[PDB]
Amino acid sequence: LAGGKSMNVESYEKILRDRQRELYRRLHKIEADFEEPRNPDDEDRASERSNDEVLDELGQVGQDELRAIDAALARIASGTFGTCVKCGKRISEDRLKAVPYTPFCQECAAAL
């Protein structure tokens, strides 16, 4: 999909990472004693998504949300972010500003 213009992917790319990591440490409470008072203090703990396991102690809402974020980030890596996989067609910019972690258009999201 040649579509560089419209819907600024960079904004969505970073907010997807922000969303997945806060939800990651939320369900990684078992393996992460560190939650911090507010800020991370330092720059960044680059050890994220390094656990290639299912684990039932992870919240299913978080796992599913992170799967949707992972699919969205994978579309960015593929260069076809802003494409409903369930249509093979373009996504609304309003869809992605509200929820960038949907591989489905609002038509499909309401049809789920």
Per CB under 5 A, residues contacting Zn ion are 84, 86-87, 105, 108
Nearer to Zn ion, 23 or 84 (CB): 84
Burial of 15 from C-beta contacts in 10 A (0-12 / 13-18 / 19+): middle
Cβ 87 to Zn ion shortest distance, Å: 3
Cβ 85 to Zn ion shortest distance, Å: 8
Residue 30 amino acid letter = I
Cβ 111 to Zn ion shortest distance, Å: 8
Nearer to Zn ion, 20 or 102 (CB): 102
Cβ 101 to Zn ion shortest distance, Å: 15
- Tell me the C-alpha to C-alpha distance, in Å, between residue 80 and each of 18, 33, 58, 109: 21, 37, 29, 19
Pick the closest to residue 47 from 32, 62, 33, 29 (CA basis). Answer: 32
Nearer to Zn ion, 20 or 83 (CB): 83
Nearer to Zn ion, 55 or 98 (CB): 98
